[PDB]
Amino acid sequence: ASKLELSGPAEPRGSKSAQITCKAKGFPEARFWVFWLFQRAAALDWPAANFSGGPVQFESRFQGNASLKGSQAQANAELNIGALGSSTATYRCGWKLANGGFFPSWGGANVNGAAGAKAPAVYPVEISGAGTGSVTLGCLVKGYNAKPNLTWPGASGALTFPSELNGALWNLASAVTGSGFPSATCAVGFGAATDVDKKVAAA
Amino acid sequence: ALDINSPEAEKNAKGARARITCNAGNQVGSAVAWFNQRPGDPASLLTYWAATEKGVAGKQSAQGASTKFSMSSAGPEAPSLSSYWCLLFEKGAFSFGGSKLNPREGAGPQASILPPSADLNTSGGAAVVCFLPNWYGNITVQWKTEAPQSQANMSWPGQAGANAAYAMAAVLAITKGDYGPGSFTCNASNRGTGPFAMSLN
Amino acid sequence: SRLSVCSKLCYAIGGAPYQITGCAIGFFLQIYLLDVALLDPFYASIILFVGRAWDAVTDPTVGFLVSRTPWTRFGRMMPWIVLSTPFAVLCYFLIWYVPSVDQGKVVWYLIFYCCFQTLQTCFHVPYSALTMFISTEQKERDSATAYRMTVEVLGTLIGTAIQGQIVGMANAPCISTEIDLQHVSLQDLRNAYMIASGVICAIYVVCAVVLFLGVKEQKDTCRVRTEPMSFFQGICMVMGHGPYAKLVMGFLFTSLAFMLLEGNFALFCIYNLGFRNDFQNVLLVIMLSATLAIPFWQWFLTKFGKKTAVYIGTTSVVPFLISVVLVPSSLAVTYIASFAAGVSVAAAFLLPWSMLPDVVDDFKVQNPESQGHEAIFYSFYVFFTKFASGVSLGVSTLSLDFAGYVTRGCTQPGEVKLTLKILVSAAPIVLIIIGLLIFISYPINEEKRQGNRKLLNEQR
Ligand SMILES: CCCCCCCCCCCCO[C@@H]1O[C@H](CO)[C@@H](O[C@H]2O[C@H](CO)[C@@H](O)[C@H](O)[C@H]2O)[C@H](O)[C@H]1O
Ligand SMILES: CCCCCCCCCCCCO[C@@H]1O[C@H](CO)[C@@H](O[C@H]2O[C@H](CO)[C@@H](O)[C@H](O)[C@H]2O)[C@H](O)[C@H]1O
Ligand SMILES: CCCCCCCCCCCCO[C@@H]1O[C@H](CO)[C@@H](O[C@H]2O[C@H](CO)[C@@H](O)[C@H](O)[C@H]2O)[C@H](O)[C@H]1O
Ligand SMILES: CCCCCCCCCCCCO[C@@H]1O[C@H](CO)[C@@H](O[C@H]2O[C@H](CO)[C@@H](O)[C@H](O)[C@H]2O)[C@H](O)[C@H]1O
Ligand SMILES: CCCCCCCCCCCCO[C@@H]1O[C@H](CO)[C@@H](O[C@H]2O[C@H](CO)[C@@H](O)[C@H](O)[C@H]2O)[C@H](O)[C@H]1O
Ligand SMILES: CCCCCCCCCCCCO[C@@H]1O[C@H](CO)[C@@H](O[C@H]2O[C@H](CO)[C@@H](O)[C@H](O)[C@H]2O)[C@H](O)[C@H]1O
Ligand SMILES: CCCCCCCCCCCCO[C@@H]1O[C@H](CO)[C@@H](O[C@H]2O[C@H](CO)[C@@H](O)[C@H](O)[C@H]2O)[C@H](O)[C@H]1O
Ligand SMILES: CCCCCCCCCCCCO[C@@H]1O[C@H](CO)[C@@H](O[C@H]2O[C@H](CO)[C@@H](O)[C@H](O)[C@H]2O)[C@H](O)[C@H]1O
Ligand SMILES: CCCCCCCCCCCCO[C@@H]1O[C@H](CO)[C@@H](O[C@H]2O[C@H](CO)[C@@H](O)[C@H](O)[C@H]2O)[C@H](O)[C@H]1O
Ligand SMILES: CCCCCCCCCCCCO[C@@H]1O[C@H](CO)[C@@H](O[C@H]2O[C@H](CO)[C@@H](O)[C@H](O)[C@H]2O)[C@H](O)[C@H]1O
Ligand SMILES: CCCCCCCCCCCCO[C@@H]1O[C@H](CO)[C@@H](O[C@H]2O[C@H](CO)[C@@H](O)[C@H](O)[C@H]2O)[C@H](O)[C@H]1O
Ligand SMILES: CCCCCCCCCCCCO[C@@H]1O[C@H](CO)[C@@H](O[C@H]2O[C@H](CO)[C@@H](O)[C@H](O)[C@H]2O)[C@H](O)[C@H]1O
Ligand SMILES: CCCCCCCCCCCCO[C@@H]1O[C@H](CO)[C@@H](O[C@H]2O[C@H](CO)[C@@H](O)[C@H](O)[C@H]2O)[C@H](O)[C@H]1O
Numbered sequence A: 001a002s003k004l005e006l007s008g009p010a011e012p013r014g015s016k017s018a019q020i021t022c023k024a025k026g027f028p029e030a031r032f033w034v035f036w037l038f039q040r041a042a043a044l045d046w047p048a049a050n051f052s053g054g055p056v057q058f059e060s061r062f063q064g065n066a067s068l069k070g071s072q073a074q075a076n077a078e079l080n081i082g083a084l085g086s087s088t089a090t091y092r093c094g095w096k097l098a099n100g101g102f103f104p105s106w107g108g109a110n111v112n113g114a115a116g117a118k119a120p121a122v123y124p125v126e127i128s129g130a131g132t133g134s135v136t137l138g139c140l141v142k143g144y145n146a147k148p149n150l151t152w153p154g155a156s157g158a159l160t161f162p163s164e165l166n167g168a169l170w171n172l173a174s175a176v177t178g179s180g181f182p183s184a185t186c187a188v189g190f191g192a193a194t195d196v197d198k199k200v201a202a203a
Numbered sequence B: 001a002l003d004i005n006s007p008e009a010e011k012n013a014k015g016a017r018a019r020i021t022c023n024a025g026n027q028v029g030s031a032v033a034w035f036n037q038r039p040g041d042p043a044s045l046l047t048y049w050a051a052t053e054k055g056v057a058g059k060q061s062a063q064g065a066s067t068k069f070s071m072s073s074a075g076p077e078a079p080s081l082s083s084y085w086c087l088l089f090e091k092g093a094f095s096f097g098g099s100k101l102n103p104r105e106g107a108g109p110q111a112s113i114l115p116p117s118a119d120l121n122t123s124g125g126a127a128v129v130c131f132l133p134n135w136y137g138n139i140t141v142q143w144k145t146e147a148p149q150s151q152a153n154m155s156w157p158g159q160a161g162a163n164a165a166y167a168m169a170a171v172l173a174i175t176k177g178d179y180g181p182g183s184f185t186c187n188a189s190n191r192g193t194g195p196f197a198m199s200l201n
Numbered sequence C: 001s002r003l004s005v006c007s008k009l010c011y012a013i014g015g016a017p018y019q020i021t022g023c024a025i026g027f028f029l030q031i032y033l034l035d036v037a038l039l040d041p042f043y044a045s046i047i048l049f050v051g052r053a054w055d056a057v058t059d060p061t062v063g064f065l066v067s068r069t070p071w072t073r074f075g076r077m078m079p080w081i082v083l084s085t086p087f088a089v090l091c092y093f094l095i096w097y098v099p100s101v102d103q104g105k106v107v108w109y110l111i112f113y114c115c116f117q118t119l120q121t122c123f124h125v126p127y128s129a130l131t132m133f134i135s136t137e138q139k140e141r142d143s144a145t146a147y148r149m150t151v152e153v154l155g156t157l158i159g160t161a162i163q164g165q166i167v168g169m170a171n172a173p174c175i176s177t178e179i180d181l182q183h184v185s186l187q188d189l190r191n192a193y194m195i196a197s198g199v200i201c202a203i204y205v206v207c208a209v210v211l212f213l214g215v216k217e218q219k220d221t222c223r224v225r226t227e228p229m230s231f232f233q234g235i236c237m238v239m240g241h242g243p244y245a246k247l248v249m250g251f252l253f254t255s256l257a258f259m260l261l262e263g264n265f266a267l268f269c270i271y272n273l274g275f276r277n278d279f280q281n282v283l284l285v286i287m288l289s290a291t292l293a294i295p296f297w298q299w300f301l302t303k304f305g306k307k308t309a310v311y312i313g314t315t316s317v318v319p320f321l322i323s324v325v326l327v328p329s330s331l332a333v334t335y336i337a338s339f340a341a342g343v344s345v346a347a348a349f350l351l352p353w354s355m356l357p358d359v360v361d362d363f364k365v366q367n368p369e370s371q372g373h374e375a376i377f378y379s380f381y382v383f384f385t386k387f388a389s390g391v392s393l394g395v396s397t398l399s400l401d402f403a404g405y406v407t408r409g410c411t412q413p414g415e416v417k418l419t420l421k422i423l424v425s426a427a428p429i430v431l432i433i434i435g436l437l438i439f440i441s442y443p444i445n446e447e448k449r450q451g452n453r454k455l456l457n458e459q460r
Helices: B118-122 C005-016 C017-029 C028-034 C042-068 C076-093 C105-134 C138-169 C187-215 C231-240 C242-263 C267-271 C279-292 C294-303 C307-313 C317-325 C331-366 C373-401 C413-427 C427-440 C448-458
Strands: A003-006 A019-025 A034-037 A044-051 A054-060 A068-072 A078-080 A088-089 A107-112 A120-123 A135-146 A157-162 A165-166 A169-178 A184-187 A197-200 B018-022 B034-036 B042-046 B060-064 B069-073 B084-086 B113-114 B126-135 B142-143 B152-155 B164-174 B182-191 B196-200
Touching: A003 A044, A019 A107, A019 C028, A034 A068, A044 A078, A044 B182, A054 A068, A078 B118, A078 C317, A088 B182, A135 B113, A165 B152, A169 A184, A169 B126, A169 B164, A169 C294, A197 B142, B018 B084, B018 B152, B034 B060, B042 B060, B042 B113, B069 B084, B113 B182, B113 B196, B118 B126, B126 B142, B126 B182, B126 C076, B142 B152, C005 C017, C005 C105, C005 C138, C005 C187, C017 C028, C017 C105, C017 C187, C017 C231, C017 C242, C028 C042, C028 C187, C028 C267, C028 C373, C042 C105, C076 C105, C076 C187, C105 C138, C138 C187, C138 C279, C231 C242, C242 C331, C242 C373, C242 C427, C267 C279, C267 C413, C279 C294, C279 C331, C294 C307, C307 C331, C307 C373, C317 C413, C317 C427, C331 C373, C331 C448, C373 C413, C413 C427
Parallel strands: none
Antiparallel strands: A003 A019, A019 A078, A034 A044, A034 A088, A044 A054, A068 A078, A088 A107, A120 A135, A135 A169, A157 A169, A165 A169, A184 A197, B018 B069, B034 B042, B034 B084, B060 B069, B113 B126, B126 B164, B142 B182, B152 B164, B182 B196
């Protein structure tokens, strides 16, 4: 079957250049227009398209910001992104049916144009001296530059909010609605070491 | 470039039928592609030329002549509650609109305020966290340090698989020097005909 | 007790729907499926190939069924026509109908195209034997055949004019693609196709009613009914003859080249010459020139012999087929080449029928025992032309799919225009050259021996 394998996530720094590969298989790459997209948090855009045996057609917004290339000796399409800062998005690599104009087969690769790499800080936010039946405990993870995996010791009542940008670092919160409170601890992920688990005390 | 769009960015449907509408800024001549995208996955082609499926379950149909198009899912299951896009292949510059389906749940919000911990207070900071774990609809959060504030960062998850309810976390970051304004209150306004206030001193 | 002129005129009028529907589904089906029905050219290739290969399949089967048809109270051929026409017009209207089907419009077009080809075979095959059934004198049959051919030419012209003007009256929007990156609607175009199909179906019916009312059957019971099982033996005997096989192969290859042009010429006019507003006027000019050039080629074959006429008539289009792809799409050059292509079409589809009696006389001289040889020749030519023209159109539309033909488009990429230039300027020239080389090996050598064979026709 026709498939398109894209590169992994990348972390350009402000004004670098990021090159994304789109190694295709299952079809002649020189016969079809290989496209590129641009997905933000929730918006689908269109940088450009490239015919592997000829021309490249861009959007007027991405002219000079994106540069497309194609290697027919390896059937690989490359997208080169110039100056960044608001280009932290997800880039897809659809191909266009040679008759219609729609995209049957797609890829997907993340680009995160930020700077810095720090260790997360864990704060056990707790109740403020009140209780009625079920009580809400919390765990605040502040100041990191990756994707962590917050967990709890065998309790499934947790809600882990999506992380947000605060300056140049990321912030995340987790909430647990627990009935009884003998002992509860917050254990975080953050695969780049810095493993820290902190108990949640009263007051 | 055309200005195709999907008006409802959110829709409520449980098991009966959904009719996602797309509107085109130009007469596209029945050239509309419909994509389905699940989170963490690329957009999958459902419909092309505004009525023709591509290896998709028979519940996904689509209608529309010009500048008014619809995709009907009359059998909406758990996989069908995803994000649906409409493309157009009439003009050179291709355009999308964005939409999403959601299940229908009751109502009833809940709020809880949490003061900064001693560890954060030691390291030159104070983040007050307001949690809104279970509610349905759209909610608004206001911070009162005896006055309204506009320095808070807010985050929302999606819809829970079991409870079918949304959540919201509001973080108010205040330094130790600015940490004497009195009492801190979190106010939530929902479809409940009254705000919920949680305060600490 | 001969044929009236009104009866011959009604019989001739009855043969107009076959030519009208043939010219419609020869010139415009490839436009309609690719652009108006919004089909992938792979599926349109399948539809065209199977549609023109099922007609050739159904010709001998319907012929064998007609040969076994008993005598009814209305005749042996009139019940076939009366029971075939109301379903044939329904299937023809549903050929040019774009349904609201979520998956498999190719199945709809395949089913209704094959059904219409079967019903049109069930109409035309009894209609071919109707000229034997109407009268016993050979002069009346020849007069009916001449009337039928004249109304066949006029029916081709009338059907091309009607379908072209109606479907070119309502234009439609196009698809802008990457290539083109620096009121009317598509439903109006589909309704124009439905209106043209309704007009042609009204003509079909009217002509069916005229054929039913004006033509009797005479209850012919004379001579012998030959042998239907000897069809393969007669095919082998005809193919064993030198001049007959040479005429079969030449006419075949030449008609195959012109059917390839007829198929992939509207796309060439639209997307290479940039005449999507007036592509029907080029077809009308070609058919009008072909209608007007028939007396010219009749005078030419009556004056300058038959060998030079068939040598120059098929090859006159070759410099113009070079010229249409070797000019920057000038309007007057295309119209002059359209006039020349009409003259060449008239020559190509007129001259071998003039060559045929010189081969019939030679087959009479060589084989004294002959029964249905001309009918066998006509059936073989019809079957192979329809089947190989279906192969050619399927390969052409599949090549358009492989070249990246955009559905509609206002333009085509550099591969599709090259394939269309090859399909109107390389493959027709190669097939015409093959037919000319086959016609070179002609041992009859025009009348120079054939009249001597006619002398032996006086001997036997
Ligand atoms: C006997 C007559 C000749 C018959 C030859 C044998 C063919 C039998 C039918 C096979 C048809 C399927 O063959 C092929 O399958 C793929 C499946 O994705 C279809 O799909 C292809 O086009 C569609 C759009 O039209 C794209 O969305 C898709 O990405 C592409 O793969 C093609 O439309 C078809 O060309
Ligand atoms: C588009 C086609 C329809 C156009 C409108 C119809 C016009 C043609 C109708 C047929 C005319 C012939 O109809 C009738 O035929 C007989 C012979 O059979 C004629 O009888 C005589 O008339 C003419 C010459 O004068 C000759 O055709 C014929 O040789 C002769 O016998 C009658 O005078 C005529 O009335
Ligand atoms: C769009 C225009 C359509 C063409 C015109 C409308 C059709 C009208 C019928 C054809 C024209 C008149 O009909 C013409 O009459 C003459 C005689 O007068 C006929 O001539 C013949 O008629 C009959 C035929 O067996 C015989 O008497 C005889 O062999 C001869 O006279 C022509 O065969 C015919 O062409
Ligand atoms: C798209 C095609 C449109 C088709 C439209 C229908 C046209 C059909 C053409 C024939 C029309 C009828 O033609 C009719 O033929 C008969 C033939 O006997 C003629 O009838 C005439 O012929 C006889 C001949 O002996 C004469 O004695 C007598 O004067 C008269 O009865 C009619 O005068 C003529 O009107
Ligand atoms: C000579 C002119 C007069 C002709 C008179 C008849 C003309 C009728 C106009 C065409 C109407 C038919 O319209 C067409 O019918 C078929 C069968 O009902 C429908 O086809 C339907 O059935 C099939 C098989 O169950 C499924 O794919 C699906 O349920 C649906 O597509 C088409 O969606 C519709 O587009
Ligand atoms: C004379 C023999 C002709 C042989 C030529 C080659 C075979 C025919 C070529 C086209 C076959 C396409 O294959 C066909 O395509 C479409 C979807 O792609 C589907 O076609 C089906 O779709 C829906 C399914 O409810 C229905 O309207 C209907 O049953 C049928 O049209 C079938 O899943 C598949 O059987
Ligand atoms: C959509 C349908 C449009 C309707 C078109 C109606 C137009 C009808 C055209 C009338 C044809 C005129 O037919 C005229 O008459 C005589 C019959 O006597 C025909 O026949 C004549 O030529 C043939 C040639 O082999 C010989 O048999 C003989 O010389 C003579 O009978 C001629 O073909 C023509 O000269
Ligand atoms: C523009 C309005 C619509 C068109 C109207 C046209 C009406 C006139 C054309 C009707 C058909 C004419 O038919 C004409 O008949 C004469 C005989 O009389 C033929 O004359 C000759 O041709 C045939 C071969 O074809 C030979 O058998 C023989 O040498 C001779 O009969 C003409 O080649 C033929 O063209
Ligand atoms: C002898 C050949 C003619 C006999 C067959 C009769 C066909 C005559 C045309 C049939 C269709 C009639 O309806 C047709 O509609 C369109 C508009 O809607 C118009 O057709 C128009 O198209 C072209 C397009 O460039 C114009 O240049 C032109 O002014 C006009 O012919 C006419 O109104 C009519 O030609
Ligand atoms: C030989 C006998 C037969 C001769 C040919 C038949 C007579 C001429 C054909 C008449 C019908 C074709 O002419 C057609 O009619 C309709 C009705 O007004 C008109 O067409 C109309 O419908 C189409 C489809 O929505 C749209 O483009 C628009 O609404 C309008 O143009 C045009 O005029 C012409 O497209
Ligand atoms: C002499 C004129 C001959 C006209 C054709 C005569 C055949 C009569 C039988 C079929 C009638 C027409 O067939 C019918 O036409 C209408 C347009 O008018 C088509 O269109 C219909 O469906 C489409 C779907 O989007 C709608 O946009 C449109 O508003 C609606 O009218 C139908 O799909 C078709 O079923
Ligand atoms: C029974 C008789 C059958 C007769 C049917 C006639 C069919 C004729 C088929 C014509 C197909 C032409 O095929 C066309 O030729 C050119 C040049 O060779 C080629 O296309 C070329 O252009 C592209 C540029 O984008 C290059 O990658 C490369 O040089 C080549 O692929 C392809 O092969 C095809 O696009
Ligand atoms: C036998 C009679 C010959 C008459 C003409 C027959 C048609 C064949 C020639 C059609 C003209 C176009 O033919 C074509 O033109 C272009 C430039 O315009 C040439 O140049 C092309 O070569 C390369 C091949 O990879 C293409 O990628 C590119 O599109 C183009 O630069 C081709 O070499 C020629 O094949």
